[PDB]
Amino acid sequence: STIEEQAKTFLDKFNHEAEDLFYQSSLASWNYNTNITEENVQNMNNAGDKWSAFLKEQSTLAQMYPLQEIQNLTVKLQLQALQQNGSSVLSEDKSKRLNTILNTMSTIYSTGKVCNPDNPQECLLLEPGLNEIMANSLDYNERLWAWESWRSEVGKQLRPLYEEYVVLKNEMARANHYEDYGDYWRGDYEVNGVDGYDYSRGQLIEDVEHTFEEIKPLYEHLHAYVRAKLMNAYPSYISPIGCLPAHLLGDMWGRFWTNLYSLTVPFGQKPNIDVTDAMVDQAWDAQRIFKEAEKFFVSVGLPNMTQGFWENSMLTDPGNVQKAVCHPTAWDLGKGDFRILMCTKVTMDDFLTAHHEMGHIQYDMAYAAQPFLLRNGANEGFHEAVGEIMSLSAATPKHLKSIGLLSPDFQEDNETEINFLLKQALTIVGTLPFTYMLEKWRWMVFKGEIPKDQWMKKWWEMKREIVGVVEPVPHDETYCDPASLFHVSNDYSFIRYYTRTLYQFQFQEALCQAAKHEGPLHKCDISNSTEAGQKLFNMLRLGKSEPWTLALENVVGAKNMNVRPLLNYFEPLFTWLKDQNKNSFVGWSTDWSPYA
Amino acid sequence: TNLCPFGEVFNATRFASVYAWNRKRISNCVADYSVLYNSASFSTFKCYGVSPTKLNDLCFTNVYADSFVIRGDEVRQIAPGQTGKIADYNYKLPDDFTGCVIAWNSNNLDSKVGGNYNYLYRLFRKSNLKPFERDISTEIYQAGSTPCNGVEGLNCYFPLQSYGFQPTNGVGYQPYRVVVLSFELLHAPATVCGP
Ligand SMILES: *[C@@H]1O[C@H](CO)[C@@H](O)[C@H](O)[C@H]1NC(C)=O
Ligand SMILES: *[C@@H]1O[C@H](CO)[C@@H](O)[C@H](O)[C@H]1NC(C)=O
Ligand SMILES: *[C@@H]1O[C@H](CO)[C@@H](O)[C@H](O)[C@H]1NC(C)=O
Ligand SMILES: *[C@@H]1O[C@H](CO)[C@@H](O)[C@H](O)[C@H]1NC(C)=O
Ligand SMILES: [Zn+2]
């Protein structure tokens, strides 16, 4: 028997063994997340530890089949994914040091506290304490105190750990034959050996930068309009030509500009579409909300939810003393077990979240027939892109009128359309320079292009130049402001939020064209379009079995990430912004700072 | 008026593992086949050659009842000309099969919280099964070229895998009890008529 035939048999044993071991761990994890007890924490760890130990053993055994002697690509994909050394290419000592470093950075982030001056007992955590300030406060000094204290007390603790974390991560990556840890992260987009669909790791840098250039005009005008509105609210704190102060952006980092809507809303006398009152007026409950979401996917030709979904999910807060982790999550436990965990309230937000979360379930169900290791999104940005387009359609006035929640006597006027697009842009567009700039900095640090004694100097140079945001207090190299965001101190790649954002409008535009939608893209509802559902399903069932370039082409007809649908979605706002900014300065000088 | 002992087959406490499928020879009795096909308790009742509709007007020399447990997605493999782990390694029907295949969901009996591992199936085998063949061997499967020495290790796998039957699995992964009725016709007494 050949090496390939041995690998097929080896993967055969792995799939059947992993399926049950993963199920045991998912089940234990579920019981803790819905019913928080000490016994459930231990059972979650024991099942989780066995699964991790199983993966470590099977990874070593997989490495004894060299990829060079395998021609069947679907075998090579599974073999390669299992074979990845990860941290296990380092010595046990280095591996142990790195794991200690990761846990300490995580613990500092989630337990880091800040106490107000003159009361060392009045202390706030990031969640909910500091986040409440950064999302709701209009007072300049309170916001500045929260922004600086978080970075000066918690960020400074992370600085030495992050320096050592980079060194060990780079050693791990170079031992795995990558250029550095950033090149390792970019490997999620790599495709080899499929003519016409290949994609190199370095090509991601070029494609992110190329598409970001086309985003700059829309962002510049979004930045200029926001700066003008804030300058009306804070005339003594904002320069008409300068960057936006970093603590005046709606959250701790300015990752999203969502919470600037109240001070920037174009037409403040036209109210939002808030369909919550109609839901309560009709006595909707959680089961109705998820039944409606199920009805939505069925209308495009996707299957209804399984019986186990309704029996085993937790669609409401359990309440009295059984405590649960209420963050909305879609669970693929394996063995045909699909569940949603969500503490649903009767609100429009949770109504849209259910469609989003059920979108994940539809994705999970569609690639269930794939081999275990290929049961995932085509790349790191696919799954979240699938979830986002579901809430795009479900939120439109057209869809809310067809399910009886929005009055037929509500008609769209262009002022509510500008209000909605501006609110969307604050979240969706505002995060794109933030996400690209943050990942560029980490890429350059891992690459070795930023020396340690210039980490924060470069971090704020790039914030000013690329994001148009300026720090309100000078920060020397004892700070580690990037690590003050969860994803950096918890070792998660970040470009996924950039690529997913472009993917979702590529998906939505393609699906809406299949749905024969007439009018602006942002008013599209793919409901009742089996043609759209079929086009999406053709990619969903692929899982990870095909190159992500091919999976994308199944939906949109193109092999690569494309920014044009994103600009098509926001075009009505773009023309309105350009007219608004006619007597404003557009762009920013980087040398102005609030500390003069 | 000797009634064929179908109750012992269908209403058994525990079914056999499919790799070790159970065979019950039925002889010298009266079988009321119409009770089964017109009971509406089974999810699969498909006959090949013979007709379920009132063909208890026939006589057969011997009737065999094969029973075992498989997951729902594998019930499709209990049919002539099918491939897959069950059809190739555990239980194989002939191309010219004359008989009926009966299956029902047994999640209420064969699933358990934490997992029921009583039922096994054969995952590896050097070759495919002849029709109506049974392999209950436990020889360690040699996937490579180095001898296994009777223990599992590199490229050496114990050939039988366990279903993990949990009540919360999807329908495709839930246990199903299967009964396969063979109708044999030899130039012989024809002892099972069953009006
Ligand atoms: C919560 O977990 C405990 C064991 O930790 C268990 O005895 C109890 O039945 C569970 N309650 C619910 C509602 O699941
Ligand atoms: C790869 O192997 C699987 C199963 O071993 C088979 O179904 C598939 O056709 C093979 N692909 C190629 C290109 O040989
Ligand atoms: C889903 O639809 C099928 C029909 O295709 C139906 O048989 C089944 O009962 C439905 N299940 C639910 C939970 O709606
Ligand atoms: C199994 O038991 C039920 C209830 O006692 C009975 O109706 C059924 O006929 C039995 N099965 C057979 C094959 O007789
Ligand atoms: Zn999501």
Residue numbers in the entry:
A (entry chain A): 19 to 614
B (entry chain B): 333 to 527
Tell me what the authors wrote about this structure, in their words:
Given that residues at positions 417, 453, 486, and 501 are involved in the interactions between the RBD and human ACE2 (hACE2), it is important to understand the detailed binding of these novel variant RBDs to hACE2. To further elucidate the molecular mechanism underlying the binding of these SARS-CoV-2 variant RBDs to hACE2, we prepared for RBD-hACE2 complexes and obtained five crystal structures, namely Alpha RBD-hACE2, Beta RBD-hACE2, Gamma RBD-hACE2, Mink-Y453F RBD-hACE2, and Mink-F486L RBD-hACE2 at a resolution of 2.9 Å, 2.6 Å, 2.8 Å, 2.4 Å, and 2.7 Å, respectively. Each complex structure was comprised of one copy of the RBD-hACE2 molecule in one asymmetric unit.
In the Mink-F486L RBD-hACE2 structure, the mutation at F486L impairs the π-π stacking interaction formed by RBD F486 and hACE2 Y83, resulting in the decreased interaction between Mink-F486L RBD and hACE2. In contrast, Mink-F486L RBD bound to hACE2 with ~4-fold lower binding affinity than WT RBD. While Mink-F486L RBD bound to fewer hACE2-expressing cells with a 1.65% positivity rate. The residue T82 in miACE2 was clashed with the phenyl group of RBD F486 but not L486. Thus, F486L mutation may be helpful for the interaction of SARS-CoV-2 RBD with miACE2. In addition, Mink-Y453F RBD, Mink-N501T RBD, and Mink-F486L RBD exhibited much higher binding affinity for miACE2 than WT RBD with ~21, ~9, and ~15 fold, respectively. However, Mink-N501T, whose binding affinity for hACE2, transduction efficiency, and frequency of S sequences were similar with both Alpha and Beta, was likely to adapt to transmission among humans, but Mink-F486L not.
